[PDB]
Each structure stands twice: as structure tokens, then as C-alpha cells.
Design a protein around this ligand. Structure first.
Ligand code: HEM
Ligand code: HEM
Ligand code: XVA
Ligand code: XVA
Ligand code: H4B
Ligand code: H4B
Ligand code: ZN
Lengths: 411, 411
């Protein structure tokens, strides 16, 4: 019941007891492991109070005030409010604690060594999509910090009934558009082709090019979502050049500095925050490997290998691999030269092992999803490849949610 | 109960019903996924007959003779023999069927597209370590086929009581020795340092160099294991050169052509075969990435990067990654130029997806362990990265077993 995980590079053994506190379910059974399924799968007042009590019990235990009167009263105070309202409201300090621990508990996130330094923006007084725009703009400006990126999250009002939901319809705050061509090909980011068409459907005048920063599509309190263009001065972008190959600039590649996921759901003491955009900084491989070299994304291995003069006839020339390393040297070099925060998969994975050691000592474990933690290139020359990881679901948490354009009853 | 797995590169969906036939347990629960734990964890006559019946029921169903008289008699015949002997003996055709399906069911094996073309050598009449040597020698010669490698397995007598076990103490038939130095460093393969010392303890005159092919250490019917040197003409080796870098030959690297695991246990209808060395051919990354570049193995990224003239000061120069690709181009190129069978991770992973499609149609699924299937470099530019895989344990199977030098009551 007190499980051991081993590092097979260093022979370090850590003991996990935190998984005992785990509540949610993983999708796996004794007879089938679903560790590689990508997206495994109202709320009544009866369900709400154990979840609030559970959350408050760990909140007061963390500020070294577990079981005191100020605890019990808050416990009673929330009990009474759930009786009277069939929901309840977090104190500001509980919101900050909750959001930081949703990130701390995100088993697929390799960046969690920084989980305690998260800037929480309370947008729970917001009522209009224009207000969301204003908040998201302030978030972007703050998080970007002129390239000295800072972790942040902005938390819009919690779900109530379920038909009054705040949603950022964008999957990320800053994403490049994707347009299907007449000849079937795709310009820009193929991932966003559908969302790009939703913005056009709502009146976005697309500059039909490569790296067109999409507009924000914001839904307030269940209403129809509204388009807003982020002031370009707030969208920090990095032109991608190589420290050796001067033809690399002529590729005309660039990326945005700020990774900021906006489609996920934050759960805190049973309260659901449907719009909670959060941002950090990139690990290079997210751009260099997946964004640029996924077959169904920008898919630039072809052109980079052509310009590298590579034996592209055979599979075993490893021309794909060789061009992949150059592309990731270039992403990292471009970001660093522009003083835009970025971490390489070697630095980030070493930090995660050091993070894991901290969490096993002062917390009893660290839920971790190996499938997502190991980088998409050079896996085994990073320390996380050789690290056994227990995956389990703790709360507060970030959860997936349906895309709003399947759920939303339009007008 | 009829689960779906998706490919996120191609949007192909397959439906798994084979997991219903699964019997063993995975280590995961509804509350904790152990998909990244490396080694998760006598036999009575009551337990034996359901396992025999289960196996025979699928054997006759596969030669299109399920439930016939020849089935029922074999069923009765094995029932009677388990009553009378508290164990039983497989027909030759059942041994071949069993061994092929142990490989077919090996969820961590990416090479399984070839599972039906396995050459099974029945060594169940063997009685002495000298006899094992003779059989293993014939296996090596056959499997090597002068570089045109052929899949094979040699099956020594099944376990009976448990103190009369046949064991190949070697983890693989052909492995390089590893010697700890006076200054603490390691010459050769650090993985084998302990086993290398066991061979010296038993009288092996080590040529204390790099790539010293270890001797076979063979235990027959529970007796003390005996040393045998494989005739060097049977050990096919590949000197590693690069198609560009002529200094690469001066690295003095080489590897053996034949991967042949010898420490695992084959389970067929409840019968345990403790010595069942099996061989195929290498995927390049096994050598180029793990053998050569694991920190706790040969660990040659340092020297290769030095000779490549690489910015080794910073982590984010990706000098490790860049040297890793060159090393794997070289392994592949050297093997192919010598006409020694080898597959690149691009060819092998594409074959495994094609293998998966075959198994989902004509079998209802394919147990697969993503953590092991995805190659240790360039993961996401291979199709298996984007393939959801269900892992579950089917039988016949290859299982891990304790190393014999912890179990063996010596003389
Ligand atoms: C500070 C720098 C950060 C880095 C370097 C980082 C890195 C990563 C990476 C590489 C992934 C893999 C998922 C993918 O490849 O798309 C990931 C996932 C994730 N990140 Fe982090 N991240 C950072 C900050 C944050 C912050 C501030 C939050 C929340 C406040 C967060 C929440 C998450 C979540 C919830 C996931 C998992 C999504 C899922 O469950 O599928 N990250 N991160
Ligand atoms: C024919 C060419 C073959 C190729 C290219 C191949 C490739 C691989 C690779 C890359 C692994 C990953 C494990 C590691 O990295 O050490 C593996 C595992 C494995 N292979 Fe295959 N293999 C082949 C043939 C065979 C054969 C003939 C058998 C049995 C008769 C077999 C049985 C296994 C088993 C049981 C494992 C998993 C060990 C475990 O459960 O941890 N393989 N294979
Ligand atoms: C399969 N795809 C669609 C999953 C989508 C997806 C969902 C997530 F929750 C998620 F975090 C990511 C990583 C991007 C990312 C986010 C952050 C954070 F600060 F915002 C930092 C960072 N470095 N990278 C991707
Ligand atoms: C963590 N380590 C110690 C696990 C050891 C280990 C156990 C195994 F069963 C296993 F198959 C391997 C792969 C080697 C291999 C084997 C074969 C086959 F034909 F023999 C073919 C191939 N290409 N590669 C490694
Ligand atoms: C099929 C598989 O689950 C899927 O491709 C996963 C694999 N691991 C990943 N890991 C990260 N970090 N990001 C991803 O999108 C994925 N995709
Ligand atoms: C911790 C982790 O389970 C371990 O390092 C695994 C990861 N995946 C692997 N995959 C393969 N093919 N071979 C391995 O040895 C490993 N090692
Ligand atoms: Zn699992």
C-alpha cells in the first residue's frame, strides 16, 4: 500500500504514500492499463460538502492551522452556505491555494517545480466578454513581462447551473490560424483549422497567411461568444533562426513566446471553473518537435532536410532525426537570444526529477504520467526516461472538458 | 467493455475485444496506474488443468478444429496425465504454437509483426550443460544465418519441482564483459559488471578489454552452472563506422549482430520453461541509443561530441541530441553495409502499426505497452507515439524471473 518507484539510471528509490490520498479514478483496472489513452473519462449539494471539507482540511493543514476553531468555523460557514445556496464561494487565499495545487497535481506537466510561484488573478467579478478580454489582456501582459515570462492563471466565475458558463473558446490564448487551401493543403497551423473557421463564421477577417494570431473568442455567463483581437504589442513573438545555418532564417519560421492553455477546467473543492486560462513558458520541444514536426501540424521536416542537403531517399538515413535536432537547436537559440524565457528538455527533465525528490520527501509522492513527462525527442538521454512514475489523480486539478461549440445552446 | 484506441496522427480508431480474454493482472488499479514501473509483480495440479484446457482450447481453435473429438481426447489425455503426473508434456505442434504466441503476446516487443515466423528448437531432451551449450551453439549459428538473421527460440526442459531448473545465467547469449577499474571507472559494458565477476568467480580468464564476448554460463537440471566459450566464428560482430565521419572508425566501436535474450521464462498452458533463449534482430536504437548512450552503459556521447566539435558547455546546445543522431546513423549504416539484418526505428514502428491493424481485425486487439514501444529517440516523429495502446497480459507469455544466482542452492 506504500509503493516504491525506482530510477534505473541512478538506483534511487522513493516511497509513495501520497497516492493513498488519491480520490479520482485513472481509467486503468487490474486487467487493463490505459496509461496511453489520451483523453480518458450539474452537480448536487450532497456531493459538494465532502469535497469542500476535504479541500478545506488540507488548506488549513498547509498553513499549519489544521483543526483549529478558525478551521471549524470556515468548515461550518461553508456547510451553511452550501445548505442555503447549493454552492459556495472560496476565500481569495483558498482560490490561490487551490489553483497552485491544481498545477502541483497535474501529473502530465513536467514544469511543476515552479508550482508554488504562480500568480493568481481573481476574475470572479467578471460579467461580460469585454471584461474577459480586459482580464485576459492584463494576464498576457503580466505573464509575458517583456520576455521574462511569469507563471499566471486568471480564474473567471465558477460554473453554477451549467447553462451559464464562462468559456474561452480558444484552446490557447495565442494560437496561429489554420486555413485549408483549394488544393486540399493547409496554410498555417492545421490543428486550428476548425477553430479558425469558427472565427470566420463569427466575423473574423482572416489575413489568410501562415502565422496569423487568432482572435480571442470569449463566452460570458452562457451568452454567445464575442471576438476580440489581442493588441499585437502584447503578443510577443520570436523569429526562428539557427546559430549555424543562415538559410534557416529564410524558412520564415516564428513562434509566440507565451504558452497559455485556455480550454481546461479547474476543479477546487468541488467547484468548477470552466474558464481559467493559465500560462507559463515553453519547453523547446513543444515548438521544435510537436508544433513544427508533427505530420498533422506544420510538418517542416521535409523542407529543413532539403535545405540541409540530406539523403531523403531512405528511412534509415535518419534524415528526419538529424533535421529534428537542428530545428530544436534553433528554437532554443532564437528564444534565448531574444531573452524570451524557454527551457530545453534536458534542463526541464532534470528539474522534474529534482522536483520529484522534493515532493516525495515533504509530500509523500508526486503523481506523474511518464507517457507525457518524457520529451518527444531524445527520450532516454533525459533522466525522466529512467524514472519510474506513479500516476494517480489528486485534487484540486485541471480537467479536460468538451469544446464549447458542441455544448452551447446558441441564439 | 469493448474499448476503443485512437491514432492521433491519422484519426484511425480500432476496437479492442481481445482484452476480454486477458487473464493475468497488470499492476494497475482504478486508483493508480503503474504503466511505467519496469518490473511489476512450485505450482499445484489443481491450478494446472484450467491453464492446460484454456491453452488447448485456443490451440485447436486456431487450426480450425475447436471442440472436435481430437480436441476432447487431447483434453482428456492431458487431464489424465496431470492427475497421474501432476504435470504434463506438450506435443511438438503445441510447443511451437505456444512459443509463437508468447512472442505474439509480448506487449513490450515492437518487432511482433514477424511473430508467426519463429523457428522453434525443441531442446526438451537435454540433460547436461554441455548439451545446452551444443543446442545454444546450433541456435546461434541458425539464427545468425551469416547476417541474414532468422528468428528462433530454443526451449529447454520445463520446470518440475523447482530445484531442478535449467537456466542460462547469461541475460543474453552474446554480451560484452564489464570490468570495474582500480580508479572506479568501468571498462566494457557496465551492465554486466556483476555477471562478468561471476564468470571470473567460476574460472573465466577474462581478456580484460572492451568488447570481450562473455562465456555462456549454463545450469542443467538444477546443477551448478558450467562455463562455455561460444566459438568466435559463430559470434557475428559489426564494426561501427560512419558514412561521413572517418574519425568514427577510430572510436573502435563494434556490436554483435544477434540479440538473444536468455534470462526470461516462457509460460505455456501453465508449464514453466525457465531456459528458453530467443533471438531476433536489432532495432538500431537498442544499440545506438541505449547500449552506447545510456549514462550507466557505454556512455559515449561525451567522446562523440568531442570529435564532432560541439558546444559542450551548455545543456541547450543540444549537443547530446546531435551526437545521438550521428551515432544511430552509424549503427544502421554499419550493419546494412555488412549485410547484417537491422531495422531502424522508423521502419519498425511503422511495421508495428501495420501489425496492430492486422491484430485488431483478425484477432480483436493487440496488447501493447506504449512506454516500451515508443523508441528512445525521436519518439513523436514515429507513428507509435501518436497511437493509443491498451496493455494487458495474455498467455502464452514470456515472463521475468529472478536471476539464478539469488535462487540457486549451491554445492
Ligand atoms: C512554467 C513553465 C511550464 C512548463 C515548462 C510546462 C511544461 C509542460 C509540458 C511540456 C506539458 C506536456 C503537455 C503537452 O506536451 O502539450 C505540460 C502539461 C500540462 N501543464 Fe505544464 N508547463 C508549465 C507551466 C504550467 C502552468 C503554470 C500550469 C497551470 C497553472 C500548467 C498546467 C499543465 C497541465 C494541466 C498540463 C496537462 C494537460 C493534460 O492533463 O493533458 N503548466 N506542461
Ligand atoms: C525479430 C526482430 C525483433 C525486434 C526488432 C524486436 C524488438 C524489440 C524491442 C526494441 C524491445 C524493447 C525492449 C528493450 O528495449 O530492451 C523488445 C522487447 C521484447 N521482445 Fe522483441 N524484438 C524482436 C524479436 C523478438 C522475438 C523473436 C521474441 C521472442 C521469441 C521477442 C520477445 C520480446 C519480449 C518478451 C520483449 C519484452 C521484455 C519485457 O517484457 O520487458 N522479440 N523487442
Ligand atoms: C494534445 N493536446 C491538444 C493537449 C493540449 C494541452 C493541454 C494542456 F493543459 C497543456 F498544458 C498543454 C501544454 C501546453 C503548455 C501549457 C503551459 C501552461 F503554462 F499553460 C506551459 C507549457 N510549457 N506548455 C497542452
Ligand atoms: C531493462 N532490460 C534489462 C530489459 C531486458 C530485456 C528483456 C527482453 F525480454 C528483451 F526482449 C529485451 C530486448 C532485447 C531484444 C531482444 C530480442 C529478441 F529477439 F531476443 C530482439 C531485439 N531486437 N531486442 C531486453
Ligand atoms: C497516444 C499518446 O497517448 C499521445 O500521442 C500522447 C503521448 N504523449 C504525449 N506527451 C506530451 N507531452 N504531449 C502529447 O501530446 C502527448 N501525446
Ligand atoms: C522507468 C521506465 O519504465 C524504464 O526506463 C523503461 C522505459 N521504457 C523502456 N522502453 C524500452 N524499449 N526499453 C527499456 O529498457 C525501457 N525502460
Ligand atoms: Zn496503468
Amino acid at each position: 500500500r506504500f509503493l516504491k518507484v525506482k530510477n534505473w539510471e541512478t538506483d534511487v528509490v522513493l516511497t509513495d504514500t501520497l497516492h493513498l490520498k488519491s480520490t479520482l479514478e485513472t481509467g486503468c483496472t487490474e486487467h487493463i492499463c490505459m496509461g496511453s489513452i489520451m483523453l480518458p473519462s450539474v452537480a448536487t449539494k450532497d456531493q459538494l460538502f465532502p469535497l469542500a471539507k476535504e479541500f478545506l482540511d488540507q488548506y488549513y493543514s498547509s498553513i499549519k492551522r489544521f483543526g483549529s476553531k478558525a478551521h471549524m468555523d470556515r468548515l461550518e460557514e461553508v456547510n451553511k452556505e452550501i445548505e442555503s445556496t447549493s454552492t459556495y464561494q472560496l476565500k481569495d487565499t483558498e482560490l490561490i491555494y487551490g489553483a497552485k495545487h491544481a498545477w502541483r497535481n497535474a501529473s502530465r506537466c513536467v514544469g511543476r517545480i515552479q508550482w508554488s510561484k504562480l500568480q493568481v488573478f481573481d476574475a470572479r467579478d467578471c460579467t461580460t466578454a469585454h471584461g474577459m478580454f480586459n482580464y485576459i489582456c492584463n494576464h498576457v501582459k503580466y505573464a509575458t513581462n517583456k520576455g521574462n515570462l511569469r507563471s499566471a492563471i486568471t480564474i473567471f466565475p465558477q460554473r453554477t447551473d451549467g447553462k451559464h458558463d464562462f468559456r474561452v473558446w480558444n484552446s490557447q490564448l495565442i494560437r496561429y490560424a489554420g486555413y485549408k487551401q483549394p488544393d486540399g493543403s493547409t496554410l498555417g497551423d492545421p490543428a486550428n483549422v476548425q477553430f479558425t473557421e469558427i472565427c470566420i463564421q463569427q466575423g473574423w477577417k482572416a489575413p489568410r497567411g501562415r502565422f496569423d494570431v487568432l482572435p480571442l473568442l470569449l463566452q460570458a455567463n452562457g451568452n454567445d461568444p464575442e471576438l476580440f483581437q489581442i493588441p499585437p504589442e502584447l503578443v510577443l513573438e520570436v523569429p526562428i533562426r539557427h546559430p549555424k545555418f543562415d538559410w534557416f532564417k529564410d524558412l520564415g519560421l516564428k513562434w509566440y513566446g507565451l504558452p497559455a492553455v485556455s480550454n481546461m477546467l479547474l476543479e477546487i473543492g468541488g467547484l468548477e471553473f470552466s474558464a481559467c486560462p493559465f500560462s507559463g513558458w515553453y519547453m523547446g520541444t513543444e515548438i521544435g518537435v510537436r508544433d513544427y514536426c508533427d505530420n498533422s501540424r506544420y510538418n517542416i521536416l521535409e523542407e529543413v532536410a532539403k535545405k540541409m542537403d540530406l539523403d531523403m531517399r531512405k528511412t534509415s538515413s535518419l534524415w528526419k532525426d538529424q533535421a529534428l535536432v537542428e530545428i530544436n537547436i534553433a528554437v532554443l537559440y532564437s528564444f534565448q537570444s531574444d531573452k524570451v524565457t524557454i527551457v530545453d528538455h534536458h534542463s526541464a527533465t532534470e528539474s522534474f526529477i529534482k522536483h520529484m525528490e522534493n515532493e516525495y520527501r515533504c509530500r509523500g509522492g508526486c503523481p506523474a504520467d511518464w507517457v507525457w513527462i518524457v520529451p518527444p525527442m531524445s527520450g532516454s538521454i533525459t533522466p525522466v526516461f529512467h524514472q519510474e512514475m506513479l500516476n494517480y489523480r489528486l485534487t484540486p486539478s485541471f480537467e479536460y472538458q468538451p469544446d464549447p461549440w458542441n455544448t452551447h445552446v446558441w441564439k
